[PDB]
């Protein structure tokens, strides 16, 4: 594996620093490294493919070095080089792709392909270098057994979940009390509704609560918390819990009362915020708990009083809500987020080559399914597969 | 500076060539194919039957092969072993050039 | 052009690696490269500016070299250097800006300024080095013709479009059926409404469809798809199609039925998702087609039944919708997105110097106008201009 | 300060470029730099911690150097090295953290800890190297005195503010006119409402305006401007200005008329856009002014006419709005944004070690409080503290 | 690719310049070039075909060279040569054809076949020469990138479109007003009709307009513009817009009044002609706009007056029209025209060998479909495929 | 005038028969002709434009010759050449255009521009070639 990495920063820091002009002395430390490779290779036979729509191309080697020592790089030098790189490019592609489709439960955090199983070989180890690519940096630290770490803008930690829970309901669904929400990606919106506007509730206050359990701990999270759930602020006709009928939701929004957000880790409160809207920091948590209340307005102008009668029918449904968005965070496990193309790269290569569903990943690399049952095997395979996608993107986008 | 593995011939095909597939300096590279060819272009039937194997008009007077044989030489001046070496070597080469 | 690049990574990898302390060896390979430049320069004169509110300044070159002599850089070494760099800084700025304004149809792609037309000259090429800046990496590959590629976040592919289409309407606008939408940036929200709640529709289902044609293909897109269009979930008074009057929209939202999203490429379905909300991957497409239906609820509680009578007036308007957001994607053509400052840099320099409208770009570099008619000339000019902006941002932000 | 930096790119460009395999000529320029350090160190005693729940550890040195012989790196070489790096890692951590807590007031922009006050010492300066980390790049340019600058995605310039202003009101709150808004992070949503639908207004048009003053100038901003304020498009029961009662808001949305956005700098209009929705560029501004109007529809279908009677009660409240989002921008001062983890890192280290509230920063490093009163002292301390967080993240995430 | 080219001008400038008797000297520069080839070849093997009713032939090499110092070539010399050429002829055919059907999307602009993918190889570049064949001349310039271009007679820029637009109509279709047209190839004919002969129109003049948007810009166009649309000057029975019935068109032709032709480029008028019939030049445009009017004759002899009553029935339908033909033009993109056989060659080879429909081109290489959705992929594939057809036509017609 | 012609078939039969990897033999008779030109030029300065919206770009000459050495053209040979042709291209354009506007009644059939009036000069005639256009 680490092998693989080099093969690239080799080419990038190559197809990039090697252009008509520059002095030799700008690549002395580079040229060398390069050659070293060619040698180790020359002679060894290879094969890639054998699955779905993936060609089976063979690769033979027999190349010379670069002794042409001329102060300044003359055009002629480049072309005689680019022609030798374009075989490694078109190669690596066919290499990444081959080990980017095979999966394994007996452990996938390891080489699978007849291409790579031969790379981890010892005689090839003579190649590694410049591991400043965020992903490899993390691959190593892991295979040595120690704390990892990655960066994400609008991470994708919440499997899609859009539902409701009726805490008080009746057949006619004309006097309900409960919550409805949408957990998806890095965002949570939750609304608490009480058709009776807490008319018979103790202290004329109805308590609500929404708990979300992350499948992985997030640390150093920058979060936006805002009152109101716009998504649940409009009239809706919804299916009943049993699917037998439909109910009507006609919200009128009030400010959430006694808002308390707790970011817990293993049941312990790590961060707690009382009615603080705007930007807040949650430094380490595996659970978010949002508690908020609907308090019947003690003083009401006529127009307001008219919405909340002492007796049914209750036609305007008092609703309070919250919106929470994780802008950025760090996770010790790889995850999809709103900026990185890893998930999309892996998913795209598999789709393009009609790769059959395997034993580890859900059909279509479905994110919701993956994060919902994020087993150790799926994570090890995902990390291997994400790290390869990142190696590939250094050369092929 | 190329293959510091000096070489290793048992008896393949055209031990002089083969170098082309593995040499990075075009000038050097043309010499090889041209020399590994110019098979004495054995095909002539003149002035009323005369199998007299001819050869490149190229060679003829178009000469250049020479000019190329030289230009390829004009860029072989580099390191590897003791100094009493390149010194003596390239100096000789130049005497071909001038 | 490539010339230009170097001039910078030269200075950055300079104004950065050269300070009171460091040991020679980390810059030996660097110092060299540097000097080489100075030489090539000295003697030549340049013409920068001469348009709008742009200062016309002349530049002469006559500077020393460097003291490879010392071991560990002494303060005195720096200052005598920084003073020589600050002429190149204040220079390049005036250089970028000059070619970051001119445009031409026929040969729009190539350099235009009396400053740059002289740079592409041959006697200068002796400068290139370390081309790892994502943008140049892509400039080159393009002059050779290959599968280029750029990375974005909330890309800006959709020209602003906010409108509606009434499939069934009448003068009173009291029983309409159609769709309304907002396509902007990387997001699409579309709602289908049927004032009659499919009372007389076959199978009591009204079909809707929204098609969006991208001006450029997007590959490796990570997309969020959610049910409902919040933007079209509230009461509105809208202008009629002919502008002669205004109609009333009073939505009540139902779940979109039989949702199907197709990402097509040249008329072919590349990806298709049936009712899958959350995160989905669209690997290569130039068109998005969203199909969804409004199905009259077969079972209704009294409160719901009351909203949907058998006869007009129809006072609650059944509405179903979808929201689609492209979080990230790759495009072979430069585009504006939510993270890169290129468009803003180019637009800002032109605005600050009162640069007159030219023959290629729309007034004010207006994004909507640009992407709506993204001609080859506009793209070549945009890429040239974006690449220069990126070269400039390595030194001046 | 600059000292500190090196200590890291030293280790990263180390724990990265030094693995089982690579040839020596890939790091010759590197090894050297490294050793140089060791020397300067060994013999000097350090001390860290002491405040709050932060341990107090002592450090001593007399570590060996590194063989500059072997051609290929043998495993044995690595391990005898990693063991020496893991003391510097676990060290630096304890170093950053120590100076990532103390605060001054005047001259609070400089070093504070008994650990760092000794680093700025002269005998240590023999270490600086490769300053290509966006943040240090900017620290230096500032020390000397120049035009700094950073890159932000969805920046955090607006302190949280959610309120309203009633321009026309009466006890019953049955015929109000005014605006309500939410300024938070990089977004602004503002709605103008007129319960009377401009029935008695000149030209049947009610003018609205929303002004937002940034605490710092933003340059090169890419902004999304859209009509409508979804957040204020639904029914609400709101507290009166004096908190004595609650009023009812029942919006119906109309298109904002004569929209004009001005981005001003010191009272001067730098950019102005008239009714342009989509993506716009604001190149340099410290104030945003949004002006928009509600124009009573001159022609109304019956359904619309019914919402707007000539006399009270006014039951449907005409509302027009705007949404503005700053996707990206450059600021000369450090700020929190939606991608960088700096604020979260600083806030997290302080929270984890129970660091007492100091004299500079608001309790909990509260962003809203910080940006609301962004004094020079808070900014200098924030920059110092953010730069240290960035140095730390090169090694520890 | 460029490789391919040579292989031909090699043979043509061969099977042509090498005849019984010619003095030697005029071929010396030729013979040479030739041999060079043979060498490079002999030894390498090739694969041809493998799709549809496309034979699968194999090839080998080892052919003697050619004499040098002779004088006048004896018959015997020819025959021993023609026999060696006839293997290359029958070869190339089988080569062109093989890469003249394969299509790729991601990178369908480059080589595909197992035959050609091996030609672009480096060890082959040893051949390229005499690139004066209009098409290759343009292939290269596109590779390096620049003002490419081709020459066409009666070009094929307009996808077939024959329709009408009724601006005033009623169920009986007895008093219509609108336009009908035929856009096809390089020609446009458009007629404006007004059954009422502008009896109630302001100034007794009815305005008409026809806009045609080209899929590619045409430059240096020589155009014939004539008054009248003969195609729409005769009685017709036409299907109604909804296909439910048929209407009667009984035209009587009047001279088009205030004719104005505008050739626009990106919305800008590049050329404008007012009532100028005959030959006009449009130097650069992507859109043509034809505006013309029907003016009721202010003075009418009895016979004329009788055709145009003050009241219905309107039995003679006043019609004005224009005819525009692009005789020649230059386009930066390949197009079909009335003289070149490229499209026909490509289409014919595919039809003859029963080549299956691929992912890029419309079924049957249908021109209208192709030009209607002339995507970048279709254009790159079309150019590759047209260039190959042109290489083939140098030897095989 | 006839002068002008050559300047082109020179470049076409040039930018065409000079590719990334060919034989000298294809151009010996060509290379020569080419150089001959360069010589005659270098040293003479030119002016074009001066009317309507026609820029006035000025030109100097001082270009090297051509490697008469090689057999097969190494890439490096091309680029060092294309860079010298692209000055003649962008030149001729500005030349044609200049004499493609000035009309003259009397002696209208003849040359006009300060660019061409200098071309018909005798010291230039040393260039005509392949007039099959
Ligand atoms: Zn974002």
From Swiss-Prot, chains A, C, D, E:
Keywords associated with the record: Calcium, Capsid protein, Intermediate capsid protein, Metal-binding, Ubl conjugation, Virion, Zinc
InterPro entries in UniProt: Capsid_hemagglutn, Rotavirus_A/C_VP6, Virus_capsid_a-hlx_vir
GO cellular component: viral envelope; viral intermediate capsid
GO MF, any single term: metal ion binding
Post-translational modification as stated in the protein's UniProt record: The N-terminus is blocked. Sumoylated with SUMO1 and SUMO2. Sumoylation of viral proteins seems to have a positive role on viral replication.
Annotated Pfam families: Rota_Capsid_VP6 (PF00980)
Protein's cellular compartments: Virion
Binding site for Zn(2+): 153
Oligomer status and interactors: Homotrimer. Interacts with the inner capsid protein VP2. Interacts with the outer capsid glycoprotein VP7. Interacts with the outer capsid protein VP5*.
Further comment found in the protein's record: The VP6 trimer contains a zinc ion located at the center of the molecule. The zinc ion is not essential for either trimerization or transcription activity of the DLP. Zinc-depleted VP6 has an increased sensitivity to proteases.
Family listed: Belongs to the rotavirus VP6 family.
Protein name: Intermediate capsid protein VP6
Taxonomic placement: Viruses, Riboviria, Orthornavirae, Duplornaviricota, Resentoviricetes
């Amino acid at each position: 594996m680490d092998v693989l990495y080099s093969l690239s920063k080799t080419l990038k820091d190559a197809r990039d620093k090697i252009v008509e002009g520059t002095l030799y002395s700008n690549v002395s430390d580079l040229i060398q490294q390069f050659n070293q490779m060619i040698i180790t290779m020359n002679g060894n036979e290879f094969q890639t493919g054998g699955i779905g729509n993936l060609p089976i191309r063979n690769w033979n080697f027999d190349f010379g070095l670069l002794g042409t020592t001329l102060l300044n790089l003359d055009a002629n030098y480049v072309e005689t080089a680019r022609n030798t790189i374009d075989y490694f490019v078109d190669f690596v592609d066919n290499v990444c792709m081959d080990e980017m489709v095979r999966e394994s439960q007996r452990n996938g955090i390891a080489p699978q392909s007849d291409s790579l199983r031969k790379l981890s070989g010892l005689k090839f180890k003579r190649i590694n270098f410049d591991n400043s690519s965020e992903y490899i940096e993390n691959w190593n630290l892991q295979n040595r057994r120690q704390r990892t770490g990655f960066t994400f803008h609008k991470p994708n930690i919440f499997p899609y979940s859009a539902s409701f829970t009726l805490n008080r309901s009746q057949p006619a669904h004309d006097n309900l009390m409960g919550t409805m929400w949408l957990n998806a990606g890095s965002e949570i919106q939750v609304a608490g509704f009480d058709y009776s506007c807490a008319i018979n509730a103790p202290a004329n206050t109805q308590q609500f609560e929404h708990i979300v359990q992350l499948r992985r701990v997030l640390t150093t999270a920058t979060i936006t918390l805002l009152p109101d759930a716009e998504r649940f602020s409009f009239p809706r006709v919804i299916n009943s819990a049993d699917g037998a009928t439909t109910w009507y939701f006609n919200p009128v929004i009030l400010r959430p009362n006694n808002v308390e957000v707790e970011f817990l880790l293993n049941g312990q409160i790590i961060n707690t915020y009382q009615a603080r809207f705007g930007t807040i920091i949650a430094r380490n948590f595996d659970t978010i708990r949002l508690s908020f209340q609907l308090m019947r307005p003690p003083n009401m102008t006529p127009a307001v009083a008219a919405l909340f009668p002492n007796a049914q029918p209750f036609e305007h449904h008092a609703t309070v809500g919250l919106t929470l968005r994780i802008e950025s965070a760090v996770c010790e496990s790889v995850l999809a987020d709103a900026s990185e193309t890893m998930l999309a790269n892996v998913t795209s290569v598999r789709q393009e080559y009609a790769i059959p569903v395997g034993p580890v990943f859900p059909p279509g690399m479905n994110w919701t399914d993956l994060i919902t049952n994020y087993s150790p095997s799926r994570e090890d395979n995902l990390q291997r597969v994400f790290t390869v996608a990142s190696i590939r993107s250094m050369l092929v986008k | 500076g190329m293959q510091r593995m000096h070489y290793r011939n048992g008896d393949p095909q055209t031990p002089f060539q083969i170098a082309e597939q593995q040499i990075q300096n075009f000038q050097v590279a043309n010499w090889l194919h041209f020399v590994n060819n110019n098979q004495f272009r054995q095909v002539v039937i003149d002035g009323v039957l005369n199998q007299v194997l001819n050869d490149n008009i190229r060679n003829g007077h178009v000469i250049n092969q020479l000019m190329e044989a030289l230009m390829q030489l004009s860029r072989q001046q580099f390191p590897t072993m003791p100094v009493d070496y390149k010194r003596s070597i390239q100096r000789g080469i130049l005497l071909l050039s001038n």
